[model samples]
Target chain A: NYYDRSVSPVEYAYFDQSQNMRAINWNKIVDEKDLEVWNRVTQNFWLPENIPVSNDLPSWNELDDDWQQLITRTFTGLTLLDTVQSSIGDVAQIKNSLTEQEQVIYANFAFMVGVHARSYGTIFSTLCTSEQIEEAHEWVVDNEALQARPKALIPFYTADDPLKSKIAAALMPGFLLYGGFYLPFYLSARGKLPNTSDIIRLILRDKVIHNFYSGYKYQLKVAKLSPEKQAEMKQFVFDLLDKMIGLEKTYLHQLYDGFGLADEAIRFSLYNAGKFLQNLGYESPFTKEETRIAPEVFAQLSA
Target chain B: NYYDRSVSPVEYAYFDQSQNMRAINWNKIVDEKDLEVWNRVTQNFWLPENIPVSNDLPSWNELDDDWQQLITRTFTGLTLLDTVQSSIGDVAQIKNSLTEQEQVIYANFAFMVGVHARSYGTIFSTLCTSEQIEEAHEWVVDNEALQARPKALIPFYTADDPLKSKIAAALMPGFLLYGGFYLPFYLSARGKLPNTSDIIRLILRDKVIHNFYSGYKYQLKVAKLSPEKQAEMKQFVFDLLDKMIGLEKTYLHQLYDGFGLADEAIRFSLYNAGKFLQNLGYESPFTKEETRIAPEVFAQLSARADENHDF
Candidate 1:
C-alpha cells in the first residue's frame, strides 16, 4: 500500500501530480484526526529565550569535580543526539509525505527538533565554560560510540521511501531517541539542576506530542503494508533500539566507571523505553517485564 | 561576494565545514532581532478547525453568478498560490540555513505555508460546490501565470545561497504574492462574502509575519554584501516586481474583461505591492502614497467577523 521512492529536489512538486509537482495535496486529507493532532502539536511552540538557564551557574559550579566532568560528557552526548535528530528532521522535510496533513505535521515535528537542539545550546552555554564546552566537544569527537550513535539514522532519512515500514523504521528509533531515552535522562536532571530541566521538559512535552503523531501515523497509515515489509520494519526498530541502548551504556560507563549515572540511567531508560514503546504501539520490546526505577537514583540525579 | 553552490545531501555537515555540529556557537547572535521575530512568529500559530465557515453558507449561494465566478477563480488562484508556496517552503526547510535560530525560524516559516494551503481547502469545500471547485481548478490548470509564478522559485531554493540580493529576489515576490496580492484581493471581497474571507485574513496575518522574518533576514544578514551584488539584487528586485505586476494585470484582464471588480482588485493589489515592498525595506514603487483601505470594506470584513482574528 505504498511506493518506494523519495521525491528528487529538481523534479519534486506538491501533489496532484497531474502537473507532476507530487506533494501531498492539502485539498485532500486521508485522516482528519491526524491533521488535528498535528495542528494542536504545532501550536505547542516554545522559545528558548523564556527558558531559564541563569540560576544553573551556581548549582553547576557547585557540583562535584568528577560529577561535573561526567555530566559535561553526558550533556555532550545529549547534544550529539539533538544535532543528529535535527539533521534527520531537515532531511525528512524533503521527503514526499503521505498526506497533506502529514506533511504539515512532519514539518513542525522537524522544525521542533531544531528547537530542541537550540534548547541544548541554552544549557551548554549557561553551565559549561568556553573551554569546557570545547573540551566536551572534543570528547564527543574522540569517542567511538558518540560518532557511531547518531550516524545510524542517516541512511533511513536519505532513503525517503514512504512505505509504512520505511516510515516506521525511521520513526521508531526517532521516538526512542528523543521521546524514550531522552525524556528520563532529562527528568533525571530535573530537580538537581536549577530550572534547566524545564527546557528539557518543554522539549519533552513537544517530543511526546511528536511521538503521538508518529505512533498514530505508524498505526493508521504505515501498519497496513504487506507482511515482510512490516516484519522488516519491526526488526529494524528493535535492533536499533537495542544497539542504541548498548552504545549509551558504553558512553555512561566511559563517563563514569560504574560509579555514577551509568547504572541509574540504564535502569530508568528501560522503563522509559517501555513507555515510549507503548506510545509507539509496541509493548516494551526492550524490557521483558514491567520496568522499574529506584527512588535513590531519582534522589541522586534530582538532588 | 556571492558564491553559488548547494550542499550535497549525501555528505553534509553543520557549521563551518568542521565536524562540529555546533551552530550559533550559542555565543553570538548575528542578529538578535531576527531571532526574536522568529520566536514571536512561531507563537502565532492558528488552526482552521476553529475558523467558522458555516456562517457563510447562505451568503455564498446568494451571490450573483458573475460574482461567484470571479471569486471562485480568485480563490483557485490563491490555492495555486498556496500549493506552490507550500512546495517552496518544503524546499526551504532542507536548505543549509545561516544560523541555528535561523534554521528553526525558517522551518516554522515553511510549515505555516502548508497551513495556508490547508486553509484554502476549507473555502473550496464549504462555500463552493464540487462542480465549481472542479471548474475553478480547471481554470487554474489552464492559467499560465499560475503555472509560471511558483515554478520560478525552485532554482533560488536549490541554490541555497544566502547572498543578500538573492534573498531579496525570492522574498520580495513571495511577500507580495501572499500579503500583497491575496490579502488585498480578499479585502475586496470583504462586504460581499460571508465568513470565507476570514481564512484569507488569517493567512495574510501569517504571511505578513513571514515577510517580517524575510525582511529581517535580508536586512540583518544579506544586506552586508559588497556594492556590486547589491546593485544586481536591486535590479532583479524591481525587474521581478514589475514583471509580477504585469502578470497580475494580465490575470485580472483575462479572468474578467471590462469588469468593475478587476479594477478594484488591481488598485488594492498595487497598494498592497507598495506595502509589501515597504515591509521589505523599499519605498512603495508602484504608488507614492501609503496603502489605503476603503471604510466599507473593513467595516464589513473586520468588524463583521471578529472571531476569525482570534489566535
Candidate 2:
C-alpha cells in the first residue's frame, strides 16, 4: 500500500523499504517534450553578470522621480514572484512530475528562477543607492495587492492535488507576472534604460518557455479526464484567472497611480493574459480589439 | 508563540500570521562572508555547453576497454553525489542559513550543483553509447559501496541540528567526492582527454568554494560551543571521517581493482581527505609520506590550482 501507484507522486505519504531506489535515466525518456524543453532551456542559459546592467546607471540617473519609483518597485515585485517560483512553485512541480526527465526540467527552471531573482539584486545594486534599495525592498513587503497573489496561490501550490498545483504554478510566470514586465518593455521601446530592458528580455525568454511548457503539460493531463470532469476543471481555472486579473489590476493601479498609464499597463497585461489562456489550450475570453497593444510600441519592443 | 526566536529557523514549526514577512535585503548583509561567497560563486558561473567536450571524442575512441569502463562509471558516481548535493544537501544549508544572504548563496550553490549533475549526462552521451550509458547508470545504482555515502549522509542532512547538518554537507564536496575526481585529474595530468578534464576542473573549482564555505561556517558554529561540547563535536566528526574513508576504500577497490590502480586512487583520496580536515579547521591524521601523490601529476593539476582556495 505504501508503494501504491494510484496516489500521485506529489504526496510522498510513505516509502516502502522493499522498493528499489530509481535513478533518473535520461536515455529512457517517458516524454519527448521533457527532453526538448530541457535542451532548449539549458542551451539558452545565462547569468546576470554577463549583462552590463551598469550601463543603465546613466539612464537611471536621468529618470524623473516617478519613473525611478515605478522601475524600482517593479523590479522588487518581480523579485518576489521569482523567489516564490524558485523555492515553492517549481519545487512542487518537480515533486508532481510523472517522468524523471520532467523533474530535471523543473530543476533547470528552478535554478534559472534563482538567477532571475539574483538578477534583480544585480540591477538594484548597480543602479541605485543603498537607502533606495532598502526602501524599495520594504515597499514590496508592504504592497498588499502584490502580496495578495502569493496569499491566494500558496494554498494551491502547497496542496496535494497535482492538477491544482500545475494550474496555479502556470499562472505565476504565465499570467500574474506580466503587469510588472509591461513598464520595462514600454521604457525599452523608448530610448530609456535599454540595457536594463535587455536583462528583462532575457528573463522574458525564460518565462516564455516556462509558461508554454507548463501549459502544454496541463493540457495533456486534462486530455485524459472525463468530459464532465474537464468542464469542472475549466470552470475552476477560468474563475481563478478572473481572481488573478482582479488582484493584478489593483496592484498595477497602485504601481502606476500617479502616472497616466494605468490603463495602458492593464491593457498590456490583458494582452498577455489572452495569450497565456491560449497557451493553456483554452480560447481567449477577449477579442484582439480589446487586448491589442500600440503597434509601434509593440513592434519596437518585439524587435 | 509561533514567532519564537528561540527555536531554530530550520524547523518552521509554526508561522504566526500576525508577523510581517521578512524579505531578503541584499543591501543590508548580516555576514560579509555570505555576500563575498555569493559574488565569487556567481562570478564563476558556467554551463557545461561552453566546454568543448566533443573534442574529447577522439581521445575517448582511443581509450582501451578498461579506461572507458572506469571513466563512464566515475561520471555516473559523480552525478549521483551532485544530485544529492542539489536536492538535499544544499537545500538543507539554505534552510539552516542564519542570514538572508547565506540562503541566497546556498540557492546559487544548489543551482550550480544541478549544472554539475547535468554535466555528467553531457559527458556520457558525448562519449558513450546508449547501451554503455544505460549499463553505467545501472552499475551506479547496484554498486554497494557507492550507495553507502548517501545512506550515511541523509540523516544528518535531514536533521534539525544546524551544526550536524553543516558538517555532513561539507564532507560531501570536501572529502567523500575526491576519489571520483582523482582518476580524471590523473588522466588529465598525463595529457589525455584534456577537454573532458577541463569540465572536471570547472566542477572542482566550484567544489573547493563549497567545501571551504561550508567548513568555515561549521567552524564558526562550533567555536560558540563550550570546550566540552566542541570536543564532543570533533569526536563525532573524526569518527565520521573514519567511516567515510572505510566506505570509500571499498568502493575504490571495486572501481579500480582491475586496472591495477586501486592503491594509487585510495592514496590520492586520502591526500584530499587530510586537506578536507584542514579545510574544516582541523589537523590531518596522515603524514606527508602517507598521503603523497606523484609529484609530476600533482604539479600539472595545481597549475590550474586544484587545492588552491583563492578566498
Candidate 3:
C-alpha cells in the first residue's frame, strides 16, 4: 500500500493536510495545533436564534434615512459575500488537496457562513421593512462596485487551477467583505447599536478564524509552487485586492457621500488588506496612519 | 411576518424534517435539543477507527472460500449504495424547496455517508489484501445489480419533481442498502465474526436513523400533497419498490446461488419494502414476515459508544 496507516490517531493534526483518506492514526499532531481551531470553530458557533435581533429591534428606528440606507447597503454587502462563501466558495474549495479533518473544519466554516447569512436574513427581516429588504438585495445585484467581489471572485472559483482557486477565494471574500467593510461598519455602529454591534463582534470572531485559516492554507499551498509561479500569484493577489479596494471606495463614497463613514470604510478595508498581504508573507501595503481599527472594539473581543 | 419566531427553539426537532430554513425563534437549542434530524444525526455519530478491522483480522481467514467471497461481495454491494448516497443523493437532493436546517442536516448526513464510505475504505483496507482491494472495487464498478441502485435513484435526484425525487431516494437507498440487505447480512455474520459485526452494528445504528429520517421527511412532505396526488405517489412507491425487489432478487440469487442467502436477502428486502409501504400508509406489496433482529449484537450501540466517540 502506498499509504501510511501508522500515523497516530491521537494527534488531531496532520503534517500534510492533503493526506485526507490516508489520514491514519487519529489524534496525532504533525501540523500546527489545529485542535484549538476546530474547538473554537464549534464553541464559537451559534444558530441565528443565539444572536437574537429582537433586542436590536429598536435600533432600526434610531437611524435616519441615510443611516438606514447606508447600514442596509453595508449589511447587504455581507449578505452577498457570505452567500458566496456558503453556497460557492468553501463548498467548491473542498478538493483532493484538503486533508479529511480540514474538510470537516471547512465544511463547518461553510455551515457557519450559512448561519451568518441567515443571521443577516433574520436581522434584516427583524429590522428592515420588507420593501427595504427587497431594495437592499436588488441594490447588491445592480450596484457595480458591490457586485465586484463575487464578480471578480467567480473566475477564481471556476479557475482551472485548484490550488490557486482555493487560496484566492479564502483571501478575497474575507478581506473584501467578511473582514473588510464588515469591520468598519461594526465600528461605525458600535455605541449607537450595541446589540447589533455585539452580534457583529461575535460573527467576526468566527470570521477571523475562517479568514485566517484560509490565509494559513494559502501560504501553505504557495510554499509548494515554484518561485516564478509564486511571483505570478503574488501579483495576482495584489490585482484582486487592489481592484477590491478601488471598487469598495467607489461604492462607499457614493453611498455615504456626506458622512465620513465612507472614508472610514476605505481605510478599514486597507488595514485589513494589509493584514491579508502580511499573512501571504508580504510587507504592509499601507502604514498605520492610513488604516486603523477602532481600538475599543478589540476589548470586547478579548473579553 | 409569516414565520413563527415564537416557535419553541426548545424542540430542535421539526415536524416536517423538510421545514429547515423555516426554523424560527431566538437563541436556543445547543445541546442535544435540535428539533430536526441534525441533532440525532450528530448524537449518533461513528468512526471507522472505532470499529477497527484489526480485532476482526483473524476472522477473515477462518471463513472458508465461499463465506469469505460472499461477505466481500455483500459488503461491496453496500459500498456502492453508500458511495451513491454520499456523492450523488443528498448533494443533488438540496433544491430551493428544502429548508436551511434540512439542507444542513442533509449535508451532514451526506458527510456522514462519506464517513461511512470511508469506513469501508479503512475497513476494506484492514481486511482485504491490496490485490483483493483492487479487484473488489473493480467488481463493484462492473456489477450490473450493484450499479442499479444509483441508476434507478439518479432520476429522482436529477428529476424536475423535487417532491417525488426526495421521497424516492429516501425509500430506495436506505431500504435497499442502508436498511435492507445489509441488515440481514450483519445478522448472518454476527457470532462468527463478532468484531466485524460490532462495526457493522454501529454503522447501522446511524444508518437506521438516516434511513428513517428520509422516510420521515417523505411521509411529511406527502401529507402536504392532495389525497389524489397521494394515491398516485403511493402506487408509484410500489411500482418502484416492486421493480427494486424484482431487480434485487435476480442479483441475490445470481450472487448467492443455492446458498439460501439469496432467499434471506430477498425476504429481508421485501420486509423492509413493506415497512416503506406502511410508512406511506399503504399495505405490503408482498406477503412476508420481517425477521426479528438477533438479540446479542445490539450491545455494540448506545452508552459505551457515545463516550468513545466525539464530534
* Candidate 2 residue runs with Cα over 4 Å from true position: A1-17, A22-28, A49-62, A224-232, B1-18, B53-62, B223-232, B305-311
lDDT of candidate 2 over B159-237, digit per residue (tens): 6787888988889888887788888878877777888777777788788999999998888888889999999999988
Best by lDDT: 2
The best-first sequence of candidates by lDDT reads 2, 3, 1
DockQ of candidate 3 (2 decimals) = 0.09
Better of 2 and 3 by lDDT: 2
lDDT of each: 0.56, 0.75, 0.58
- Candidate 3, residue B154: how far the Cα is off, in Å: 9.4
Taking all chains together, the TM-score of candidate 2 against the true structure is 0.86
DockQ-best of 2 and 3: 2
Error of 2 at A243 (Å): 2.3
lDDT of 3 by residue, B121-153 (tens): 666667676565654545555566655555666
Write model 1 residue lDDT over B1-311, tens digit each, in one string: 00112121222432233342332234445568755775566666676766878777677677777667667776666655555544454335434454445655666666677677676676667777766765666666657665555555555555545443334333533443532243333534554454566666677666666666666556545367787877776676667777777777777766665455556556666765776566657777564342455656544334433443555
Model 3 whole-model lDDT (C-alpha atoms): 0.58
| Count of backbone clashes, every candidate in sequence | 6, 0, 25
Descending-DockQ candidate ranking: 2, 1, 3
Docking class of 3: incorrect
Fraction of native contacts (fnat) of each candidate: 0.17, 0.14, 0.01
